[PDB]
Symmetry: D2
Subunit: 496 residues, 4 copies
Amino acid sequence: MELLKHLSQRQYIDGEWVESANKNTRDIINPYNQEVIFTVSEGTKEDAERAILAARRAFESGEWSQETAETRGKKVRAIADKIKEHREALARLETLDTGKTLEESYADMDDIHNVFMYFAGLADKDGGEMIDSPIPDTESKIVKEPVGVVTQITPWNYPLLQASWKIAPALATGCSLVMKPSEITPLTTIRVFELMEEVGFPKGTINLILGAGSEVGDVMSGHKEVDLVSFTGSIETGKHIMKNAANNVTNIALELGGKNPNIIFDDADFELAVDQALNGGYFHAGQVCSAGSRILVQNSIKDKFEQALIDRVKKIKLGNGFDADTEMGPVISTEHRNKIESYMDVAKAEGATIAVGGKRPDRDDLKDGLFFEPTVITNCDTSMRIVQEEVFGPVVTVEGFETEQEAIQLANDSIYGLAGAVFSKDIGKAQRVANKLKLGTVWINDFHPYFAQAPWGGYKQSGIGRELGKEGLEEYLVSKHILTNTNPQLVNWFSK
Amino acid sequence: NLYFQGMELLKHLSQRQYIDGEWVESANKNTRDIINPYNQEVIFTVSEGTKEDAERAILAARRAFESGEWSQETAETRGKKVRAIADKIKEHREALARLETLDTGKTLEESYADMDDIHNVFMYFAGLADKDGGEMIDSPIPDTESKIVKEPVGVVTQITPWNYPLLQASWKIAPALATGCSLVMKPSEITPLTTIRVFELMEEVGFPKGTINLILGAGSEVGDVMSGHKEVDLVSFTGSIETGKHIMKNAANNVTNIALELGGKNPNIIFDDADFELAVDQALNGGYFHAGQVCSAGSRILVQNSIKDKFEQALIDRVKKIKLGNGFDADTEMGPVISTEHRNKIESYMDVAKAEGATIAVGGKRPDRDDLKDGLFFEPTVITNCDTSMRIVQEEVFGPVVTVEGFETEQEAIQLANDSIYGLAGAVFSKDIGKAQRVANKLKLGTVWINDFHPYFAQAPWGGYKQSGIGRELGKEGLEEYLVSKHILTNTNPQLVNWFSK
Amino acid sequence: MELLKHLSQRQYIDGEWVESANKNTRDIINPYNQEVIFTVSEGTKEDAERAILAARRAFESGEWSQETAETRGKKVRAIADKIKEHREALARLETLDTGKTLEESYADMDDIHNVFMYFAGLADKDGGEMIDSPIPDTESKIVKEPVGVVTQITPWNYPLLQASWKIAPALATGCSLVMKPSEITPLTTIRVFELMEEVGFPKGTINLILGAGSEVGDVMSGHKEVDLVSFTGSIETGKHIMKNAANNVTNIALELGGKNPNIIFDDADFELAVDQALNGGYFHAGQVCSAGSRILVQNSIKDKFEQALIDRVKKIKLGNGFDADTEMGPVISTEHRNKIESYMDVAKAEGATIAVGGKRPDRDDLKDGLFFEPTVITNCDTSMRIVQEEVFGPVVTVEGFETEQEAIQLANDSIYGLAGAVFSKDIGKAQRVANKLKLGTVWINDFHPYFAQAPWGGYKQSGIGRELGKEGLEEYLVSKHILTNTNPQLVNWFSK
Amino acid sequence: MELLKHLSQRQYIDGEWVESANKNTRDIINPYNQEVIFTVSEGTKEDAERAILAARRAFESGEWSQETAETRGKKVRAIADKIKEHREALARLETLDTGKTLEESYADMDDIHNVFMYFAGLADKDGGEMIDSPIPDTESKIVKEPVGVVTQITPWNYPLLQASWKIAPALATGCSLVMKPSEITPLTTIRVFELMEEVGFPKGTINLILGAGSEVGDVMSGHKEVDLVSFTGSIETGKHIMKNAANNVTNIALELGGKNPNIIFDDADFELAVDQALNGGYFHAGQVCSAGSRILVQNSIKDKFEQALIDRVKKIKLGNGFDADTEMGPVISTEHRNKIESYMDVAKAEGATIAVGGKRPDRDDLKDGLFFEPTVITNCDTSMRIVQEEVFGPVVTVEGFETEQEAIQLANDSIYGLAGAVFSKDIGKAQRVANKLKLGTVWINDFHPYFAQAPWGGYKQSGIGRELGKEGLEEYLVSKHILTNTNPQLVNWFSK
Ligand SMILES: NC(=O)c1ccc[n+]([C@@H]2O[C@H](COP(=O)([O-])OP(=O)(O)OC[C@H]3O[C@@H](n4cnc5c(N)ncnc54)[C@H](O)[C@@H]3O)[C@@H](O)[C@H]2O)c1
């Protein structure tokens, strides 16, 4: 609440904080109590176009695109320092907006700092290659250039984190960007723009559009001047975006959902598996793309595991993200909670069992909030929708498997392939499994970790491209082969 | 004679599709007649596959990929197989070149050069197969091991054009096999000859059942299965912009990656301080090799005003002497265009140009000469008095046609050259190399040639900026379209987090 | 014997097969029976100089150094094909010259083929980099060039194998080379030069000097025109070479000996450990740089292990390398056998036990040959010379250890660091150990494997630089930074 | 000024500032006036050993070597920030100690900052590779580890700059180091150690020895526990160091002298060439390893060029490095000035001409200082010592050439190959030349620039290895190939 007293309420376009073209606004809600906490501009599609054209003009002027990579790196480092300096405030702002615990928000800010720092350090390390030309008397080189104008669209679950993954490499490479956060959670994204403005970037290099994807999204994906669309969100929106981007053969980087398996063998450290099954399923109320919603447990320990998990789920402390006792916060919106509730009806209807949870909590201090009980669904199989689809709530399904081959089959039996885990003390076995899983990230005896040093993204329908790591940077670069003939000779193919 | 020998080849050439290790007919036994553009005679009849055939191939590729017979084979061994394919190309170099000239109509010498490139393309990728399996990352988390493993992407569909059939096919096949993917290829319905032949050769080398598949058919009938089937992990397409957009939209249904190699409106920038005769020679080469039916064609000539009049005159005079004829005759400098339909598009573009106010300085019609009457020939053409706002300048005609525009300054040449939706390739001619470098840096093109025109090679990536494409072919980047990264993170000292209560 | 009827007996200098400058010769001996089997030229130091000057002239002419990398790659591939084509004959020639089994020689030829093929494929893959310059209006690039003239010196144990590791990358990069094999084993090296000549290389690009290192070695290491000395041999010779190479600040790549540990935990697959302890200690009669001469076995199974090993050592079949029943051949020379024998006296004198072997075999069919029984030395410790020094014979020492830390400490307690192994079914433990071992190569549950795809070399005193892999190629390249100022301006630091 | 009042006077060993073991000291002299300005400890060989053993102990404890690369990077960044924070004081300290102008010292500090920043950013970017193993059922990976204990020896010309090139990558990779600056110029090196201590590194990770290479140098190059010797200095000292390092097969990185050509064609921008010839020859009174001491000018403009250069040399303002008017300071020592003077006698005796300078300046305010006039030597040829040898003073030679081929031949006609330049408006020609020059760095239309992003080092006798760039980091890393057999099988080569 104090934090918002000086926070900007507007969009940032072509170096100026401006309102929506039609002065329209939107109320931002705190999911803990559903109170309106802040009011921001609700931009129009013309605002998005104007931002894009400004990014284009700025890119062509070359003030940022022709700046030395070393200097661009120092600026990105400066942004990183700002994140660390305002770490406390940013974490509170994110907990206020998304509802997750304050400790989870602090960890985000540490990651974000590191994300910017990583890309700041990578900026001046690889400018292309020299090729040994197969043509005598020619020089061949590949220069890597910033792709140009980039649109960046993020989700509401980890707003600033997902924003950092896009902004950092865009600025490091010299691109101009136009970013639009989830309409429902713009707070930390607004704040980071204020911070980037303080660091100082050329007019038009960075732009912030605030609005609903349904209104402004198509301009951002289908405008002719966009060279790349980087999107993190749901599969249906990503498909739509890709179809639209095709109108101008615009490259896309998509970071979509997952149906991430958490494979638990009987030779796994049992208490560790239970601990990590809870972590995997319920951090941020399961509103995490890396969530371990699909638990695969070996039959010999399935019954014992289900019991232990259920018993633990019954003790999970729900509450306000600002209270240190809180272990799980509310879900993001009314709409989202409704989808979760409909999924419970779907599960019962297909023949599955709600072993625990599956409803709103009764407790007094939670009535006003968008809470939903941590849930465990049993007696289910791969043919069911509750197992195949991304619920994105505090819900997990438990399936049994007999053999190592069967666990692999089940784990890969989904349209997705973002991330997953394998728990077993037999490391050789965990490696065999990891190798056969069609997942962008595989954890052996762990669950959730990602970091700037390594690429993150999907196999199959969890995405296209990668974020983080050197590959994350490559989404923002384009190669140019400049071939110079040092002893040009007439070919005389067409008779003189 | 050389014609005769090319035609003899057809009597042993397969007429069918290659699916799941078997040469088979179309599911409905339908067929198609292949035509030689030099005389329009039917020269061969092949199967015309159905969409079900394409699905069956895709499912076979999937089954083969999952069995691991190729995907789990050692990279070194995969490299040897790809090298074996390369050796086949060289061994059958003569026959393949004649087959390509017969099918596409381009000169035999141009076809020989293709076969040399193709050999080298396979050889390059054969050598690259076992060189980079991923990375070891220094993890920021103590007591963890972090590594990135690069795996073959899976099932890949490959679609090619009629201009340089085997060349474009090699750019896709080589890295696919080198990385361990399974593939389903469909060449242009109009030119399947060399693609069929290369499959016979790949079969001789020996690959596991389903690893390679050849579908023969029209993109309008089987294309959507190849781009929109759930089991496809990557669609690699080389063709026109409209088809590519359609493909990308369809591939989106399953969030399927795409690599697109589309057209271009490639500038050939000529400064007054360029070696004049060299610029004229390369303007002709740029515009008329393969009758301008080349994606790297220099259709848009930008010449500095001080030498524009002198240049136009020299170019026109040279265009009047270009020898047209049969690709098999050594005297032939330019062959026919590929089809009736395509020649008609070119003819309509001449009407478009006159209607916008441009001038057909020379050519712009079918040649009269007797020995060319039966063929799909079209005269090499030069269009003058035109500007960037015109369709004849902005759009890819893909025929033996070039436009000439003047420019005063270096900045103006860059602006005109970048004033198109495309960005595949281009050239700069000037003896002032520093200037050519400044220009090259500002051109939004995947490939820029300084004092040259046309060269590409396996060692370096080829592809577009802007609407000329997505992704790259050739070079290490060409191989990366066929790989997918996996981050395997191992916690070597796992500890409970105890976030959730007791 | 028939193989030698057409084999050249001369040196190859500046495109010509020539005799020694003083017509001196040397008799080559078959260690199986000590019979003279061939006579070759014994070159003079002036021959070595002439070769070096020819390599220099050839390098400067640019016929090979300026040839396209792609074409160079095809030539190296052609050499590879020759190896495969003459595989049978080469293997027999190596068994005749070195005395190792024919099967071991066949495996060498397969490796060699692959070594050339690997480097043939690597030739045109990396010509340098484009750097993002921190100075505005400048272009910065790094071009990688062949280093120039290279001298290559090899040992008698695996003559052609060690030669291939040097020749392949030298030719692939465009260098000129002068090679000198061990004076006692020149057969396969001569043959490969005949084969390289058939392929065709420009005059002076390749040169073969035949002679004793004590006579011609110093020219090869200390001549001003040499840019790199690549040496594979013993530590003392390497030190001498490095000292001499210093006279002209000449780069060196050294591949020296080792005291390679073979660590066996009690949770190792017991029979596998015994099998690999034998393999590690007795392939090629222990005359291998990767030999597992130092066995470290966990105390709990030490007694059982020693007994099993000893019993197996007593059944090792000695004989002629050409007989299929032969499991271990003779040692290379009288001199070398004598060193091994004196090491037995050294061991007894320090208080160690010759548990088995330690002498020449009695059997009739072995009397004439340079045989020495496979040996096991027990009751020894790290302070002993028999444990610290490279015997390079069919001999192994057995030391016990209690803990994982103690095994690491003992394994690292030597001046060397070439290779080693860890045997345990607990893979996590084997990884912890592997990470702490100061060895260029570590095998987990295996012993001996190397391959072109990966670099091989030492930590500590086992060497300087690497052979094989991309790093192997880098020993033959030198970087040049070409910086172009595209907008040169006077600095005017000094008064006008 | 007051800068020295708080500056430490001692060595830094094993986390403690300590005196020499024998309490011996040394007086530091300001070359501007030859006054003693500071007194520091003069360490013994035992001190150097103790530092080395402390570095070893620290490396094995793993407090720094096992720290995450990301964290190591942050520390190196912290050092970089210290340099920028104390830039003023450091620059004055370097001008006081070395005598060069204050502006030159400020530029150094900017470079140094950037050197540390670059390596800070490179620290966590490449930990090794995954190899596609040719052996089925095996995993192959290459891990890059810090090499271990490193000794670093620097010259007196650019003390802190040369130190930064070694310290930055050493710390970034996780090595322990023992540094010894030139005995005559320890001021900035002492200061940077105080700064590194403030940042905080584990006990023994960094050590500073102060001495005389003739007394402590051999311990630093020949001690068994050293894994790498990084040396920047003269060729004779480097050779000595290499020979000594050989005793323990210790890797060496040598950055030695040069006889750098400055090639000037008749189609060069004339005034630019004259300006850069002066810069190349007289910055820091020619006491720079990248000095353009050997001018090669095309005959058609040779006479005109010599006249213009001479006229400009006559106006060079000599004086105190602290005075803004000063363009060139004094030379470092009496001994060094004497060497320069004897080289003038050598030049006259071989038949060359001292066209201008070649003596001490007469002006009053320079009488007390170690000044020497900027000099130009004409009518000389490649056979002369004045042309072949590194004088390392404010001296340049001028040679004529007719053709492009002749310029290349003359430029490469020396034992060295560190750096050089080509001046011509015909860029294509400058590229042809640059390609043929055997130099680690080639400047086209510029002279002197180096930067962290690109490797610097020599061809031929100018050195071994590289500093700066990724290659600079690689001198501090060693590769380990860990091969795991995932399906181990008995080989059964030996009888059961
Ligand atoms: N590190 C590895 O990759 C590797 C591989 C195989 C063998 N090796 C080692 O090599 C050794 C093989 O034994 P060796 O007896 O052949 O070694 P050696 O040092 O006695 O002989 C090696 C080579 O050096 C030559 N030589 C002798 N004096 C020389 C001199 N003064 N200057 C230059 N060259 C001179 C010899 O003629 C011979 O060609 C063993 O120590 C073994 O461990 C190492």
